Write a protein that binds this ligand. Structure first.
Ligand SMILES: Nc1nc2c(ncn2[C@@H]2O[C@H](COP(=O)(O)OP(=O)(O)NP(=O)(O)O)[C@@H](O)[C@H]2O)c(=O)[nH]1
Ligand SMILES: [Ca+2]
Ligand SMILES: [Ca+2]
Ligand SMILES: [Mg+2]
Ligand SMILES: [Mg+2]
Length: 166
């Protein structure tokens, strides 16, 4: 079937793993074990089409920036994640976006901007700021909570679909 190779990128602790785990395995990971590189594979139905999701969960910890170029070459689309209660995580998105941009040598890489932890009342990144950033990229912005499951399906399936529009 059609296999979609998604990569989840973003700063440490923003919820990349929890998002992926909630999606593929339908539960919330409450603890924080930093990731190096984990791979997930799951067959799903999106717009009547049975497709395979191949999802690479990546390190947001700087102890692993060197591995970035490899995963950015392979992937067909990137879930670019920050957390809405962490302004520095939002400021970190540019580096990921530019890096992806250089690697693929394209201004038109399938990507989705995700502001995670929208359950948390302690917001410092306004939706408006992220809408403006994503607009400059020509991609969607979608808020999520790995904790409540809010928007998690919309995020990943929107990404799958973005890999289609191209
Ligand atoms: N309240 C809340 N907590 C969240 C959410 N997503 C992740 N967390 C919490 O934030 C912490 C970090 O989550 P994790 O998924 O491990 O982050 P990560 O981006 O994968 N980290 P790393 O880059 O180091 O691998 C965990 O304690 C997790 O429960 C969310 O939507 N809401
Ligand atoms: Ca749990
Ligand atoms: Ca390159
Ligand atoms: Mg992780
Ligand atoms: Mg402000």
């Amino acid at each position: 079937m059609t296999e979609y190779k998604l990569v989840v990128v973003g700063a440490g602790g923003v919820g990349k793993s929890a998002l992926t785990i909630q999606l593929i395995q339908n539960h919330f990971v409450d603890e924080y074990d930093p990731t190096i590189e984990d791979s997930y594979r799951k067959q799903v139905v999106i717009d009547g089409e049975t497709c395979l999701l191949d999802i690479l969960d990546t390190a947001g910890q700087e102890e692993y920036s060197a591995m970035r170029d490899q995963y950015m070459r392979t992937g067909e689309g990137f879930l670019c994640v920050f957390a809405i209660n962490n302004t520095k995580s939002f400021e970190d998105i540019h580096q990921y976006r530019e890096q992806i941009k250089r690697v693929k040598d394209s201004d038109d890489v399938p990507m989705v901007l995700v502001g995670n932890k929208c359950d948390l009342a302690a917001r410092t990144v306004e939706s408006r700021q992220a809408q403006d950033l994503a607009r400059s990229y020509g991609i969607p912005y979608i808020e999520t909570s790995a904790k409540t499951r809010q928007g998690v399906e919309d995020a990943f399936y929107t990404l799958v679909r973005e890999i289609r529009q191209h």
